[PDB]
Symmetry: C3
Subunit: 559 residues, 3 copies
């Protein structure tokens, strides 16, 4: 608002404790924070801006296998010897995955025509009622025709229009026909980019030996892998997995630092099985798929249908490239700055916990080692300044016999303030730098109030809680309170040019006396504004400074 309020700055008040304990603890905690953050910075390279890589994988599988087996075509079974090369056991998959056929079931000479279903999964029909024309299910190799026909002697099945002879349902051959595929080799060419860092690298370095095969120990940087070795590394068996197939994962990790002084961008090759470790009791065990090779002889389309089992090798290339970036370093430092409140939190918790009072009587006798730590009480005394809410029902009373002040914050509701009991607030220590018979009356000098019957509950108070000498007869009472010269001097200190013979001057003196007593018994001003004078002292003060104007008022809210 105002211009003065604009250029103002708040800084917290603090207290510096000269304690070897706190200095030690604070520096230990600060050094622990600093050491941890430096270790994290120089281990996780949090000063480096890290960028993900753009990968490109190109794969080539080399190796040939020979398969000698009996094959049936045109109703004739013959022993055929065949050769499988890259073009024969690989699919033209161009990317991060390649497939090697380890086993196959091929049906040759297929022609679109009518034929019986092969009876492999309960496809047995005894009458045309068991076949629905145009019907199909997932196990159907064709579209059912309404009429049954005999597949062979002593066995009958539904007729279907399909590629015939229909695919016989037979399990994967054991041993795998292309188990020799464990000896095949795959070259993986992996090119990675960090655009932000403007860096490119490949998994193939100049001077590489072509007649190399990866080995984690002897040759961990040759990107030519034997498939059987890939399987042994984990513990898998290629010949067993070859029968029904599987999925293998080739992980190429690039933890690259592009800093010149610390430069290292090399691929780490790891192998995982991404298929279920299936057994003889497993649902959908393996990896198979059907493709067809189409041809035609004698002017009619035909196909060889191959159900291929094999291992699909998915290739997961991942990693990060780090290069020094001052923004990252500065941001990390800024984040870590907050960590250094550890010392303040810990030491302040100790100070507040060891200044709970309960610790002194109970904990110390049980444990004498933690005895002197009660010094924290001193530290809490200087650190904290308790302040009460100033409210109309707040009162303070003091009894000479009593040791301290009573905070009667509870509304009286007609009960005498003498009777009412409240919190026992300690009396503050004086500024020694300067020093250097009503039913509720125990003193006898208390006069009955003059307030309204409801209001007089507050003024019903005695200088002491038990019978004895009145505070009013104390010699110091006249010196401090009733001393006209002292009150006049105080007023002059306040208002040096006030009329000495004013009509209302007496009233002012009375107020001063109220303050004086409230300050003599309730040291703190905050505790002296809300104090309540006993009836005896109040009425002697009134006698010394009476008011002909009318009935004397009473305690009024300070604020």
């Amino acid at each position: 608002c105002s211009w003065n309020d604009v250029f103002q700055y708040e800084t917290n008040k603090v207290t510096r404790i000269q304690s070897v304990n706190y200095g030690t603890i604070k520096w230990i905690l600060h050094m622990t924070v600093f050491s941890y953050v430096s270790f994290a910075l120089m281990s996780d390279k949090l000063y480096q801006r890290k960028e993900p890589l753009i990968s490109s994988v190109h794969t080539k599988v080399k190796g040939v296998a020979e398969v000698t087996e009996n094959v049936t075509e045109g109703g004739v079974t013959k022993l055929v010897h065949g050769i499988f090369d890259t073009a024969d056991y690989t699919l033209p998959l161009q990317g991060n995955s390649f497939f090697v056929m380890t086993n196959y079931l091929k049906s040759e000479g297929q022609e679109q025509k009518l034929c019986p279903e092969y009876p492999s999964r309960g496809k047995q029909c005894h009458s045309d009622q068991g076949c629905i024309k145009g019907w199909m299910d997932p196990q159907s190799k064709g579209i059912q025709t309404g009429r049954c026909i005999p597949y062979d002697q002593k066995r009958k099945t539904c007729e279907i229009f399909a590629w015939c002879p229909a695919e016989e349902g037979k399990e994967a051959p054991r041993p795998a026909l292309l188990r020799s595929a464990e000896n095949f080799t795959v070259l993986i060419k992996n090119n990675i980019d960090f655009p932000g860092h403007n860096y490119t690298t490949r998994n193939i370095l100049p001077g590489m030996n072509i007649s190399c095969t990866f080995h984690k120990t002897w040759n961990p940087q040759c990107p030519i892998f034997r498939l059987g070795d890939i399987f042994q590394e984990i513990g898998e068996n290629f010949t067993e997995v070859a029968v029904q197939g599987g999925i293998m994962g080739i992980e190429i990790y690039w933890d690259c630092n592009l800093d010149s002084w610390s430069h290292r961008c090399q691929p780490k090759y790891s192998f995982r099985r991404l298929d279920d470790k299936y057994t003889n009791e497993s649902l959908f065990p393996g990896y198979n798929f059907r493709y067809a090779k189409y041809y035609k002889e004698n002017g009619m389309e035909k196909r060889t249908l191959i159900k291929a089992f094999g291992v699909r090798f998915d290739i997961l290339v991942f990693g990060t490239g780090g290069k020094f970036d001052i923004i990252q370093l500065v941001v990390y430092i800024g984040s870590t700055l907050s960590y250094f409140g550890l010392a303040t939190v810990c030491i302040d918790l100790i100070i507040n916990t060891y200044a709970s009072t309960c610790c002194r009587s109970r904990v110390y006798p049980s444990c004498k080692c933690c005895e002197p730590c009660a010094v924290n009480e001193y530290y809490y005394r200087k650190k904290c300044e308790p302040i009460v809410e100033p409210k109309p029902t707040l009162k303070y009373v003091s009894f000479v016999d009593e040791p301290h002040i009573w905070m009667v914050d509870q509304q009286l509701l007609g009960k005498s303030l003498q009777d009412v009991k409240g919190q026992e607030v300690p009396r503050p220590q004086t500024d020694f730098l300067e020093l250097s018979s009503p039913d509720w009356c125990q003193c006898g000098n208390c006069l009955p109030s003059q307030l309204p019957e409801n209001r007089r509950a507050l003024e019903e108070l005695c200088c002491r809680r038990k019978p004895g000498q009145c505070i009013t007869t104390s010699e110091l009472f006249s010196k401090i309170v009733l001393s006209r010269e002292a009150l006049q001097l105080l007023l002059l200190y306040q208002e040096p040019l006030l009329a000495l013979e004013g009509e209302a001057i007496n009233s002012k003196l009375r107020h001063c006396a109220y303050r004086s007593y409230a300050t003599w018994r309730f040291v703190s001003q905050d505790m002296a504004d809300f104090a309540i004078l006993p009836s005896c002292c109040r009425w002697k003060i009134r006698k010394e400074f009476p008011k002909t104007q009318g009935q004397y008022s009473g305690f009024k809210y300070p604020y």
Copy 2:
């Protein structure tokens, strides 16, 4: 630096307000923060380290369809009945996407030779000038030859060397030939890994029924999906999309908790359309691609070119696997600790806002409900201690007639300090614990200065701003200021063994008197160092304690 400065610890000074309001508000806000953080922890499982999954998808589509249609080859059109099985309507795509052919346009008997362009997109030529030899465009089915030839009667087009007869440009057949593909079923085998958690699972559980088809309600865990059902789930129509094709997405979500007490790793299957919901008015509507089946009869290469329309089903497998990690829990707790400053911020804002002064005169009459909250002023009085910048131009003046002190921080530049007006700083309350005629002159006792003409602007001051009794004649002035015994006692309190008859002792006494007045009128010491004594009081003090040494000096900078 020094060893003492090493073991020092700063702890903020604080004030504890005994207020039911603040205790209540503080605990409400703390409980709200705590409840929110606990809810977030136990809902988002922020105590769990979450790891992304490595997925592997293997898909198998089963189902057959029959297509009866007129096909033209070698110039002969014949009604051909054909059967499409998995090997016929699927591409050998091995991964997260599979394609089902829903429609096709096949050109048979193609041979590399010369033939006319089919006139489908304005490929009309009337002379050889309209054809450019060797020319090609994206709509060209061949390489233009320079000479026109007649495609048929009453129509002519450019000659091309291409696969002939050239692909006729005709729109996707309606209805789709393989709309029966809505009845096909796809099995998705999904294997996921969490390496950090060392966990593997598959979307297929033991005891699964093979004769099952996914249903969100009856059977949400069968990984066999009917394609038509996939489309209905969203609202799409397979037969309509079958004509030109599309792209569908199968999302497999894995929200997995690997904690033993709370273990749940199941796939959630959802379906999305990744193609545009195209209509009769849409650019590039659908999904089609051309492949060829190559063969040869009579020792010459030929091909059947198939333009295939269908639905590509991309499969998006994503998810997270969570397992309890104490580091995550501790880090989250550490993050949440900062949230608990809500109470301090709110309550301190209330205290500072309700102690703005402007609130009292203006806001309270309008709203009497927010009347007692002025207690915050008290809380601001104890919390904050305003301190001014000590600067050479800083002065304070007090006038008996005036109620408080004036902070004249503006340089005089020759203007009398009496004339100059400045900020009205309130007079601090005394430590009652101890208590318990120049043109600018209104008093008449002010003597003209003796400073340089420029310097005397500061000393041009009167005890009061209006005519009246001088402060100097006040009885308390002699008691406090001019009282030789009092000043000697103060000096002894300072230096108990100072010479009582020293030559310069008078000067010391004078200084003491300056302090005494500055303390009698400007209570706070910080406000009494920079105070300026009126001419009358200063010159009476000089008269009581004169200096034969020479001309008296004046106010000098405290620091």
Copy 3:
């Protein structure tokens, strides 16, 4: 614990400095923080919830090429003219990558039979010992048979069962046969989804011109790209890369804002080379793969094996879609709130640094510009209150001749407290508001102690460190310390109703005197509890208030 302790609230004590410097610096720093956070919010759109996109890419390549070359089949070499269209130079890859064949080496008429290895990589054998039956290596086109055979005159090689005639090992033809592929065009249909934002868009907009080809400047939104143009954009040469192949990346970026007032969702097309920029000296340079086309003539399976070189174009679609979210805005604001401690940190650092004392004597003479800034000392005086650890070995001593107090916190171990020297703590300023011959003896009035020989080291102290007048003879000593009336008044102020003739009253008076001296010389109470009185003053006090009970005790721990 107690109900009173529940409703308590701590608020830090603060001091508001009225400094134009701090107000200015604080507001400058606050405005810098606020401006930075607003700039970041409105640039990075940190008020927007950002969601990653789900992409779908469908690609179509159009263009034809003619290749005239000599081809060998069945032992006959003939000049063959061929045509390559989309079905001929593309693989049926359905996804984010497409392949265009730019070169090829095809071996025709292959039949499974026995044939010699082609001698291309040192496959020279002179006797059957150089061939191992059943042997295979990665360069083997077949399975070795034990017997050598002559490939041709004057050259011999191992026999193999393989597809024969065996693949001749010859390098990629130059120039590329399908270099015309630089003129081919690719249409990329890219459909993106933001599920959270429920937004879908495609890279193709209504009103697009089909006869368009992408251009960064003229036509940056046509998704039809000429491949040669893709290469020129970077700087690559299609005809050179066509020979052996490569990999290109097409990046489609979607920076989309879905806010209605600011709506922009358009694709940004960029091109990168994902292959190594290989040369004549590079390992595994290019991109090639082998596939086969299978057929049969005369009832025997045969194949044409094509080694295809080309460019695989991977398509990387990435981006984020932002929509206004109040949670994001509020969270970002909450994060930024902490940034506004910049002013407090900076100004408090200035205050603490410029109040180091060392700055005054050393820095100021060297630089007079930074002279008045010593005002920070004042600010440190009000801000910080040093407090020492109260410990049994803590003592304070004062010598009239000395200027301040000495903090002797070191255990004496028998050495006289007079001899022991310690820290020079300054004497605090008095509350002027109220003001307004042993060997170690230099005064002569010190009496030898009466403590145990070990304990008397503490009491061995003199009022002054050098010979001179004793403090005890000072007139103020009797007024303050020995004045019986003053001590009685103090005690009455403490206990107004204490017996005036009690047996132990003298002892109380003695204690009061100890306090009085400790307060006269050690102003601060904390520094006066641990003070040590000189022997002379202590023994005069004892003489005035002797104790017949027995030997006088000495300083005891305050707490």
